[PDB]
Amino acid sequence: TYKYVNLREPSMDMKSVTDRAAQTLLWTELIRGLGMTLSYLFREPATINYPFEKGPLSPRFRGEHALRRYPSGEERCIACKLCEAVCPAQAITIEAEPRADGSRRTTRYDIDMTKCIYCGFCQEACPVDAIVEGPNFEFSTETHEELLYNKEKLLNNGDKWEAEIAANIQADYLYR
Amino acid sequence: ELLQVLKRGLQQVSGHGGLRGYLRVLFRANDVRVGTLVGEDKYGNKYYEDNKQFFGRHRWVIYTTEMNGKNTFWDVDGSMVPPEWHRWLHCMTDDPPTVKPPTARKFIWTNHKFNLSGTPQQYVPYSTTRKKIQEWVPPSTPYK
Amino acid sequence: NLTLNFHGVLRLVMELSGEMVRKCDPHIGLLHRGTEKLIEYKTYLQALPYFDRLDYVSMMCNEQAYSLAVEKLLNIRPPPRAQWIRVLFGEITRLLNHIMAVTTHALDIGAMTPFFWMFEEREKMFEFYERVSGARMHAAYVRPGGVHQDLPLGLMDDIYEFSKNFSLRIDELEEMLTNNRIWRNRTVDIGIVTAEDALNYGFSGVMLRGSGIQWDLRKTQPYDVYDQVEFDVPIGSRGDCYDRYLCRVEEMRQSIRIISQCLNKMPPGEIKVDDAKVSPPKRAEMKTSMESLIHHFKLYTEGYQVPPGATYTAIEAPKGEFGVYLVSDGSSRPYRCKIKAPGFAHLAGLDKMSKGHMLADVVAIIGTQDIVFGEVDR
Amino acid sequence: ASATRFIQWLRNWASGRDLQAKLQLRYQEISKRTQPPPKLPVGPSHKLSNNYYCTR
Amino acid sequence: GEYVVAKLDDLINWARRSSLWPMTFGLACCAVEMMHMAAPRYDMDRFGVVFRASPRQSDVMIVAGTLTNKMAPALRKVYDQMPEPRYVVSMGSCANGGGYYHYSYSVVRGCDRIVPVDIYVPGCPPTAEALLYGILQLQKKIKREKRLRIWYRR
Amino acid sequence: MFMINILMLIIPILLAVAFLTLVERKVLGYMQLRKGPNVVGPYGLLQPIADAIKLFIKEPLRPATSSASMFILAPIMALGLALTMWIPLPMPYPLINMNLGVLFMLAMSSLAVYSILWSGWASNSKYALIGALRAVAQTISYEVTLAIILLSVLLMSGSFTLSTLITTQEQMWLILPAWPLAMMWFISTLAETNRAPFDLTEGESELAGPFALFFMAEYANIIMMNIFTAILFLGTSHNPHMPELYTINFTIKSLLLTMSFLWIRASYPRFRYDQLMHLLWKNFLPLTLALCMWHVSLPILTSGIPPQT
Amino acid sequence: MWFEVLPGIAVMGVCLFIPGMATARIHRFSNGGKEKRVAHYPYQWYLMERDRRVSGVNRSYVSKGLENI
Ligand SMILES: CCCCCCCCCCCCCCCCCC(=O)OC[C@H](COP(=O)(O)OCCN)OC(=O)CCCCCCCCCCCCCCCCC
Ligand SMILES: CCCCCCCCCCCCO[C@@H]1O[C@H](CO)[C@@H](O[C@H]2O[C@H](CO)[C@@H](O)[C@H](O)[C@H]2O)[C@H](O)[C@H]1O
Ligand code: SF4
Ligand code: SF4
Ligand code: SF4
C-alpha cells in the first residue's frame, strides 16, 4: 500500500489563480511561518537548570564502573575472568592468585575507561554481581592517566556508591 | 491575571525569606522559584520539589556553600550530590532517602567526596601486582 | 574551471565553472576505523555493539539487521514478544533518524529553528532507549535471539503519551518548511534522479521511492512482524530533493501509525529464544541450576558457535537498505562481515546528481541523501 | 501548563493550533518512577518432561 | 600591586570562562550528544557557549568522535589556527584513547597524541549532561588560572 | 556643549549594540524552546560585557596581509561610517539638521561597500577576495531598489530633510499609502545588511578586537536601518513641548522593527546567491520602477503635491 | 519564560532613548530654553543673523519685543 506525497494539479479557475497570486505578492505563507515561531516565543522553554536540576535516568543506566562487596565486606569478585573474556573493547585486565587465607581473589583488576564502551556486558557476565556500571556519569578528568582505573580505584567506587548501586540493582534484578 | 502574575513574583521574594535570600538564590542558582523542602543532607545541600513544574524541573537541589573544606558559594559541582540523594534527584526513584533510607553497610563511605580531578587528592594509576622475577643477589663476601 | 578543495567529516574536491559544478569528487575514509576487520576478532555477541556505531543515528535498526543475519545462520527464531519490541523500537529509531535527517538538512541551508524543536522530541526518545537498555544511544539491546531485557513496567504508557502528541510536532515542522517558498526554491527540481538511474547506481530507500519506484523491504521482504502492521509507503513523483523531503516527513507519520499498532498488539511471553545454547539464561537460573551456569559460562567466554555458511541479510533501515554479508566458518567468531551501508552507494551518486547545479545545491543534495559517515566508512 | 489565559490565546492563535491539548512538556501524565516489581513469564522450553533438547 | 593583579586575573578569567566559544569536530557518534547539549533541554548557549563558531573565533576545540590517521593532520591544522587562549576537550572513549577501535590500524589511539588536551569526558558516548559537566569543569579550570600573578612575579 | 552631544550619541549606540547581541540570543533562544544566556549576570545582563572583554584580550592573529594600509582602513571605515549615519537622525531633533539629510545618508551608505572590498584585498587570499566580490555585488544591487523606493516616498514628503518626514506623517503613517514600497524596503534592508535569509557571507564561508569592531559596525547599521524605517513609514507625532514623548514612541517602534529582524532570522532558510539576485533584478526592481512611475503621477493627479519646504 | 527577555530589551531601549533625549535637552540649554533655530535657506539665515545683531549681546536666541520700540 502506497500514497503519493506530491501528485496534485492546481485548480486553474480564476479564483484559485488569484489566491496563488495573492500568496505570491502578499507573502501569505511566509507570514504564517512567522506565526509559528511567534507562538514558540510564548511557550515555556524545555531547558532544565543544570547542575541544580538533572536529566531523568533509570535504574538500568550504564555509568561509571565499581567493584562490589558482600554485606560482610568480603569482595564479591572471585577472579573468574568472565568479564575480561566478554569485554568487547578488551578494556579489562585481571591477575589473580590464592589469597593468604586461600581465597580465590584478584591481585590486578584494571579497567581502561578510555578503551571501555560502557556496554554493560561485563556486569551481565559476572556470576556474582561483582562488577557493575554505577549511576555516576560526572567523572571527567584533566588527564588521561586518571581514567586508567586499577583495583583500588574500583573498590573505592564500590564503597562510595554502594548505597545507590544496591538500590538500583534491587529495582531491576527481577528483569535480569 | 497580569496582577496575579506579579503577586506570585512578589511571593517568591517572601518565599526566599526577604530580598537578601531572594538575591542569593538568583546569583547562585539563576532561579528564584520557591519549592517544598524535601530534605537536607549532612553536607548542607537542600532538596526541593514542585510537582506543578514539568518533568525535569520538578526536582532540584540548592548546593551547600561549604563541602569537605571547600568554599562552594560560587563553585558548585554536580558531583557534590551524595549517592543516597543522587538516585532521587535523577528520578531513578520516587522515594527520597528521608522516606526510604539506604541500607547501612560498614564499608560504605560515611563522607561523600566530589570530583577530585586536578587537585592533590586526584587518583594516580599504578600496577597493583608484585614483582614477578627475582634477581640473584651476589654474595657480600669476596671469593673470586 | 575553478577547483575547490572543500554525519561526520567529508572532503569534497569540486570543479566549478562560474556558479556551476562540473565535477564532485568525494574523498572519504576520514572515519574509516576498520570495523569489518575488528569484527573478525570478536565473538558474535562481542561484535553486536559495533553495529550501534555505524549509522549512529539508527542504532537499534542496525542491531536488528545484524541479529536477523545471525539468527538466520543459527536456524533459530526470536520469540514473538521480542519481535514486536524490535518493530516497536525499530520505528522509534526511524523517528530519531528522520528528525535528524530533516532538521539538519534544514539547518544546513539556514532553517535552524525546527532543529531545536524536534531535538527536544529526540531527547524524550533517548529516554525510551535508556529505560530499556540503560544507554541513550548505543543500546546494544537487540541481539541474536531477541532482546536483552523486557520492557520496564510503565514504559509502554510513556511511549503512548509521547506518540499521542508527535504528529502535531510534525505539523509544526511542515508549517515551517513544506509550503515555504524559500524552502521550495532550495529543494524543488534539485538533484533529480530518474527511476532507472536510481536502480543502476545502487540506491535504496527514499532515494528510490522519491523517483516513483514502489519498493520497501518491510512490504516486499518483511522481517520480524512487519507483515502484521498496516502502513502506507510514501512515493514521490519528481525524483528531486523536495519529494524526498516529503517522503521522509510522511514516513515519520507512518512510523507513528505503526508504533500505535505495536503498543496495542504487544503480546505477553519471553523476549529471547528459550534456547540456552544461544541466549543466556536468567540470572536466577544461572545461580541455581548447573546446566544454566555452564551455559552462561560458555556463552560469555567462547560464545555460541554458528553453523558454517554465508548470508546476505537486509532490512529497510531509515537511510535505506542496510545489510550484512555474514560468513560463518562454523566457529564462535565470524570469518567475514561485510556491511552494506545505503549511504555508500548514495554518496557515490553525488557527482551524477550534482550535474548542472550550483555550489549551494551540493549542500542540499548531500542533505537529501542522509549521509552518516560511520556507515559510509565503517 | 502555567501560561495565563491571554498568553494561551495568543500562542494558539499565532500557531493556528490548540497547543494546550498536546503540550510538548511533560507533567503528571507520565508513569511513576517507582514501579511494583515485575514477575516475568518463562518461555515454552520451561517444562519438566517431553522436552528433550534434540527435539528443539 | 598584588591586590590589583589578583583582581585583574579574576576579571580576565571571568570573561574567558563566561564566553567560551567552541569549535566542534563532530567526527562521529559523540557529535550527536554534543548536538543534544545544544538542544533545548541543556541549551549550552545559556552558559555563554555559542552554538557554533568558526575556528578563527574559537576558544575551545571539542573533539567529539574517532580520530583516524587520515584525519589527524587536518585536526592538527585547525588547532594550530586557533587564536590563544585555546583549550581542547576530548569527548568520548574514541578521542580519549581510541575506545572500541583502539587496536585498529587506521585509528589514532587518543587525540592527545595530536594535540594537548585539557579535559577528558568519559563515555561511549558521554551523555549530553556528562559533556556539560565537562564544559563546566573547564570553566572551573580557567577560573584557577593566575597568568598576571605569575607574570608580575617573573 | 556640542562635543558633549556627540558623545551622548556615540557611547549609547555602542551600548545598544552590545546589548542587542544579548537580546538576539535570548529572542532566538525562546523561539527555539530554550532560554539563551541566563547565567552570566542576572538574565544574562553581563553576557555582552564578558564577550567584549574576552574578544579584546584574545590573541590578535594577523595572517600575512597583502596591504597593511588596507588592513587597518577597512574596519576604521566600517565603524566610522556606521557612526556617521546617525548624526542626521531626528529623534526628534537631529544632532546636525541637514537640508539634504536623506541624500547624505544615501551618500554615506554607498561608501560602506568599500570596507568589504578593502578587506578582501587585505585578506591576501583568492577565496576571500572572491567572497568579498560576491558580497559587494549583492550589496550594490539592493542599493538600487532602496534609492528608488526612497525617492518614491519623498515624492509624498516633498523634501530631502529627514525632519520633514515627521511633518509628512502628522496625520497618518506613510505605511498606509505606501505599504507595497514598505514591504520591499524592509526586505531590501535585510539583504542590504546581509542578514538572514540573505546572510550569504556566513553561509558561503561555512561551506579578537578587529573582528569585534566589524561586528559592532554591522549591528550599529542594523539598528540604524530600522530607525530609518520607523521614520520613513511609521512616523511618530512630535510635540515640541514634550520632545521625550516622541523619543519613547520612536524608540519602541525602532526596537520592534529591530526584533523583527531577529524574528525573521529564526523563521526561514537561506537564499541561494542567484536566487536573491533574481529576487532583486527580476522581482523588486520591475515593481519598484512601476511604483516609482505611479508615485510620480499620484500627487499630480490627486492635487496632493507636497510643499517644497 | 519569555518575559526574561525584557531586561535586555529594557537596557537597549534606554540606550536608544538617551541620544534623542540628550540632544533635545542640550538644544534648550544652549538656546535660552527654546528649540534650536532651523535655517535651511538663505532667508532664514538672514533673519538669524539680523536677530544676532538685534539682541545686543551677539546671540540669535535672545529675543527683543516691543520693549525696544
Ligand atoms: C489604485 C492603484 C494603486 C496602484 C498600486 C497598486 C500596487 C499594490 C498591489 C501590488 C502589491 C505589490 C506587493 C509588493 C511586495 C513585493 C512582491 C514580491 O516581489 O514578491 C515576490 C517575491 C518572489 O516570489 P516567488 O514566489 O519566489 O517567485 C515569483 C517570481 N518568479 O517574493 C518575495 O519577495 C519573498 C520575500 C522575501 C523576504 C522573506 C523574509 C521576510 C518575509 C516576511 C516579512 C514580513 C513583512 C514585512 C513588512 C515590513 C514593514 C516595514
Ligand atoms: C576591553 C577591556 C579589557 C580590560 C582587561 C585588561 C586586562 C589586560 C591583561 C590581558 C591578559 C591577556 O592574557 C594573555 O592574552 C594572550 C592573547 O592575546 C594569550 O596568548 C599569548 O600567550 C601565548 C602563550 O601563553 C602565546 O603563544 C600567544 O602567542 C600569545 O598571544 C595568553 O595566553 C594570555 O595569557
Ligand atoms: S562496559 Fe563493556 S567495554 Fe566497558 S569494561 Fe564492561 S564489558 Fe568492557
Ligand atoms: S568481576 Fe565478576 S566476572 Fe569479572 S572476574 Fe570478578 S567475579 Fe569474574
Ligand atoms: S566514543 Fe563511542 S559514541 Fe563516541 S564516537 Fe567513539 S564509538 Fe561513537
PDB file of C-alpha atoms in Angstrom, chain A residues 1-7 23-30 32-34 36-37 39-40 43 46 56-63 76 80-82 84-90 117-119 121 123-129 172-176, chain C residues 42 45-46 48-49 53 113 117 120 127 130-135 138-140 143 148-153 169 172 175-176 179-182 214 219 231-238 242-243 246-247 250 254 282-283 286-287 293 296-297 300-301:
ATOM      1  CA  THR A   1       0.000   0.000   0.000  1.00  0.00           C
ATOM      2  CA  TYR A   2       1.351   3.398  -1.016  1.00  0.00           C
ATOM      3  CA  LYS A   3       0.383   7.056  -1.249  1.00  0.00           C
ATOM      4  CA  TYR A   4       1.544   9.942  -3.416  1.00  0.00           C
ATOM      5  CA  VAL A   5       3.200  12.739  -1.467  1.00  0.00           C
ATOM      6  CA  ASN A   6       3.160  15.336  -4.263  1.00  0.00           C
ATOM      7  CA  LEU A   7       0.790  14.427  -7.134  1.00  0.00           C
ATOM      8  CA  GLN A  23       0.064  34.403  -1.823  1.00  0.00           C
ATOM      9  CA  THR A  24       2.951  35.311  -4.145  1.00  0.00           C
ATOM     10  CA  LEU A  25       2.578  39.084  -3.832  1.00  0.00           C
ATOM     11  CA  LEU A  26       1.381  39.357  -0.223  1.00  0.00           C
ATOM     12  CA  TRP A  27       3.746  36.679   1.151  1.00  0.00           C
ATOM     13  CA  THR A  28       0.977  34.864   2.995  1.00  0.00           C
ATOM     14  CA  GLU A  29       2.729  31.547   3.663  1.00  0.00           C
ATOM     15  CA  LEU A  30       5.765  33.416   4.973  1.00  0.00           C
ATOM     16  CA  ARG A  32       2.101  32.017   8.529  1.00  0.00           C
ATOM     17  CA  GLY A  33       5.609  30.757   9.268  1.00  0.00           C
ATOM     18  CA  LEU A  34       6.232  33.844  11.391  1.00  0.00           C
ATOM     19  CA  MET A  36       4.654  29.615  14.311  1.00  0.00           C
ATOM     20  CA  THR A  37       7.925  30.999  15.669  1.00  0.00           C
ATOM     21  CA  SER A  39       3.838  31.026  19.159  1.00  0.00           C
ATOM     22  CA  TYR A  40       7.020  29.363  20.432  1.00  0.00           C
ATOM     23  CA  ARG A  43       5.832  28.788  25.174  1.00  0.00           C
ATOM     24  CA  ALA A  46      12.226  22.996  27.776  1.00  0.00           C
ATOM     25  CA  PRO A  56      15.925  11.790  34.358  1.00  0.00           C
ATOM     26  CA  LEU A  57      17.654   8.409  34.349  1.00  0.00           C
ATOM     27  CA  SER A  58      16.503   4.877  35.140  1.00  0.00           C
ATOM     28  CA  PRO A  59      17.951   2.124  37.351  1.00  0.00           C
ATOM     29  CA  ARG A  60      19.475   0.487  34.263  1.00  0.00           C
ATOM     30  CA  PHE A  61      21.666   3.497  33.444  1.00  0.00           C
ATOM     31  CA  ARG A  62      25.175   2.423  32.474  1.00  0.00           C
ATOM     32  CA  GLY A  63      27.672   4.758  34.126  1.00  0.00           C
ATOM     33  CA  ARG A  76      32.233 -10.370  45.500  1.00  0.00           C
ATOM     34  CA  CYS A  80      36.588 -15.921  37.180  1.00  0.00           C
ATOM     35  CA  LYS A  81      37.667 -13.574  34.333  1.00  0.00           C
ATOM     36  CA  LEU A  82      34.296 -13.822  32.561  1.00  0.00           C
ATOM     37  CA  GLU A  84      37.557  -9.886  30.820  1.00  0.00           C
ATOM     38  CA  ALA A  85      36.589 -12.547  28.277  1.00  0.00           C
ATOM     39  CA  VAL A  86      33.353 -10.865  27.190  1.00  0.00           C
ATOM     40  CA  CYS A  87      34.617  -7.251  27.129  1.00  0.00           C
ATOM     41  CA  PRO A  88      34.214  -6.073  23.503  1.00  0.00           C
ATOM     42  CA  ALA A  89      36.991  -3.490  23.959  1.00  0.00           C
ATOM     43  CA  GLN A  90      39.484  -5.660  25.876  1.00  0.00           C
ATOM     44  CA  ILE A 117      32.493   1.371  25.504  1.00  0.00           C
ATOM     45  CA  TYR A 118      30.158   1.355  28.527  1.00  0.00           C
ATOM     46  CA  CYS A 119      28.223  -1.523  27.005  1.00  0.00           C
ATOM     47  CA  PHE A 121      28.462  -6.724  29.025  1.00  0.00           C
ATOM     48  CA  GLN A 123      28.036  -6.743  34.551  1.00  0.00           C
ATOM     49  CA  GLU A 124      25.864  -9.215  32.604  1.00  0.00           C
ATOM     50  CA  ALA A 125      28.663 -11.781  32.517  1.00  0.00           C
ATOM     51  CA  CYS A 126      29.627 -11.532  36.184  1.00  0.00           C
ATOM     52  CA  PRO A 127      28.115 -14.515  38.044  1.00  0.00           C
ATOM     53  CA  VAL A 128      28.288 -12.839  41.468  1.00  0.00           C
ATOM     54  CA  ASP A 129      27.336  -9.202  40.751  1.00  0.00           C
ATOM     55  CA  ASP A 172      15.933  -4.071  38.153  1.00  0.00           C
ATOM     56  CA  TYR A 173      17.211  -7.543  39.113  1.00  0.00           C
ATOM     57  CA  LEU A 174      13.783  -9.103  38.524  1.00  0.00           C
ATOM     58  CA  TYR A 175      14.219  -8.057  34.895  1.00  0.00           C
ATOM     59  CA  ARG A 176      17.530  -9.946  34.744  1.00  0.00           C
TER      60      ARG A 176
ATOM     61  CA  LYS C  42      35.150 -10.802  18.195  1.00  0.00           C
ATOM     62  CA  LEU C  45      27.942 -11.142  20.797  1.00  0.00           C
ATOM     63  CA  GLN C  46      31.120  -9.043  21.048  1.00  0.00           C
ATOM     64  CA  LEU C  48      26.995  -6.561  18.134  1.00  0.00           C
ATOM     65  CA  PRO C  49      27.969  -3.175  19.678  1.00  0.00           C
ATOM     66  CA  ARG C  53      28.258   2.713  15.809  1.00  0.00           C
ATOM     67  CA  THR C 113      14.678  26.611  14.376  1.00  0.00           C
ATOM     68  CA  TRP C 117      12.008  21.951  18.480  1.00  0.00           C
ATOM     69  CA  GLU C 120      13.574  18.002  22.348  1.00  0.00           C
ATOM     70  CA  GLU C 127      14.840   8.272  27.383  1.00  0.00           C
ATOM     71  CA  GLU C 130      17.838   4.479  28.236  1.00  0.00           C
ATOM     72  CA  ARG C 131      14.911   2.956  30.120  1.00  0.00           C
ATOM     73  CA  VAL C 132      15.071  -0.360  28.229  1.00  0.00           C
ATOM     74  CA  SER C 133      18.870  -0.596  27.912  1.00  0.00           C
ATOM     75  CA  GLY C 134      20.495   1.911  30.272  1.00  0.00           C
ATOM     76  CA  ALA C 135      22.053   3.854  27.374  1.00  0.00           C
ATOM     77  CA  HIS C 138      24.346   2.658  21.864  1.00  0.00           C
ATOM     78  CA  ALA C 139      21.791   0.396  23.478  1.00  0.00           C
ATOM     79  CA  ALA C 140      23.200  -2.988  22.406  1.00  0.00           C
ATOM     80  CA  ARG C 143      20.598  -9.240  20.000  1.00  0.00           C
ATOM     81  CA  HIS C 148      18.398  -8.316  26.226  1.00  0.00           C
ATOM     82  CA  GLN C 149      15.698  -7.369  28.768  1.00  0.00           C
ATOM     83  CA  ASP C 150      11.952  -6.936  28.971  1.00  0.00           C
ATOM     84  CA  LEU C 151      10.285  -3.555  28.921  1.00  0.00           C
ATOM     85  CA  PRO C 152      10.264  -1.962  32.385  1.00  0.00           C
ATOM     86  CA  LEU C 153       6.791  -1.606  33.849  1.00  0.00           C
ATOM     87  CA  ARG C 169       5.236  18.342  16.186  1.00  0.00           C
ATOM     88  CA  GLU C 172       4.707  22.434  13.150  1.00  0.00           C
ATOM     89  CA  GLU C 175       4.341  24.772   8.788  1.00  0.00           C
ATOM     90  CA  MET C 176       7.957  25.952   8.699  1.00  0.00           C
ATOM     91  CA  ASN C 179       4.876  25.471   1.707  1.00  0.00           C
ATOM     92  CA  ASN C 180       7.722  27.918   2.375  1.00  0.00           C
ATOM     93  CA  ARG C 181       8.699  29.366  -0.998  1.00  0.00           C
ATOM     94  CA  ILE C 182      12.330  29.707   0.105  1.00  0.00           C
ATOM     95  CA  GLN C 214       7.338   1.213  -5.465  1.00  0.00           C
ATOM     96  CA  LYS C 219       6.480  -4.684   2.469  1.00  0.00           C
ATOM     97  CA  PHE C 231       1.095   1.341   6.874  1.00  0.00           C
ATOM     98  CA  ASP C 232       1.482   3.132   3.556  1.00  0.00           C
ATOM     99  CA  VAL C 233       4.710   3.684   1.637  1.00  0.00           C
ATOM    100  CA  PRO C 234       5.165   7.333   0.568  1.00  0.00           C
ATOM    101  CA  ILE C 235       6.033   7.691  -3.111  1.00  0.00           C
ATOM    102  CA  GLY C 236       7.419  10.722  -4.900  1.00  0.00           C
ATOM    103  CA  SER C 237       6.815  11.831  -8.473  1.00  0.00           C
ATOM    104  CA  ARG C 238       9.609  14.260  -9.419  1.00  0.00           C
ATOM    105  CA  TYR C 242      11.626  18.261  -2.339  1.00  0.00           C
ATOM    106  CA  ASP C 243       9.764  14.995  -2.965  1.00  0.00           C
ATOM    107  CA  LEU C 246       8.038  14.983   1.637  1.00  0.00           C
ATOM    108  CA  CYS C 247       8.632  11.226   1.614  1.00  0.00           C
ATOM    109  CA  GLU C 250       5.262  11.228   5.601  1.00  0.00           C
ATOM    110  CA  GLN C 254       3.509   6.255   9.151  1.00  0.00           C
ATOM    111  CA  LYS C 282      18.100 -15.709  33.521  1.00  0.00           C
ATOM    112  CA  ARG C 283      20.411 -14.766  36.375  1.00  0.00           C
ATOM    113  CA  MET C 286      22.282 -19.258  36.387  1.00  0.00           C
ATOM    114  CA  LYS C 287      22.681 -19.158  40.182  1.00  0.00           C
ATOM    115  CA  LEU C 293      25.679 -21.917  34.928  1.00  0.00           C
ATOM    116  CA  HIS C 296      26.111 -18.929  30.987  1.00  0.00           C
ATOM    117  CA  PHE C 297      29.846 -19.513  31.435  1.00  0.00           C
ATOM    118  CA  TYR C 300      30.056 -15.310  27.811  1.00  0.00           C
ATOM    119  CA  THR C 301      33.546 -16.749  27.170  1.00  0.00           C
TER     120      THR C 301
END
